[PDB]
Each structure stands twice: as structure tokens, then as C-alpha cells.
């Protein structure tokens, strides 16, 4: 459903 963040590290919910 979420996948990843998209900035630097992504695991940032």
C-alpha cells in the first residue's frame, strides 16, 4: 500500500 518515502532514506513514514 505505502511502498517507500521518496526524499533520502526510504523507511520514513
Curated annotation (Swiss-Prot):
Subunit details: The mature envelope protein (Env) consists of a homotrimer of non-covalently associated gp120-gp41 heterodimers. The resulting complex protrudes from the virus surface as a spike. There seems to be as few as 10 spikes on the average virion.
Gene: env
Subcellular location: Virion membrane; Host cell membrane; Host endosome membrane
Species of origin: Human immunodeficiency virus type 1 group M subtype B (isolate BRVA)
Function comment: Acts as a class I viral fusion protein. Under the current model, the protein has at least 3 conformational states: pre-fusion native state, pre-hairpin intermediate state, and post-fusion hairpin state. During fusion of viral and target intracellular membranes, the coiled coil regions (heptad repeats) assume a trimer-of-hairpins structure, positioning the fusion peptide in close proximity to the C-terminal region of the ectodomain. The formation of this structure appears to drive apposition and subsequent fusion of viral and target cell membranes.
Membrane topology: Single-pass type I membrane protein
Cystine connections: 4-10
Official protein name in the record: Transmembrane protein gp41
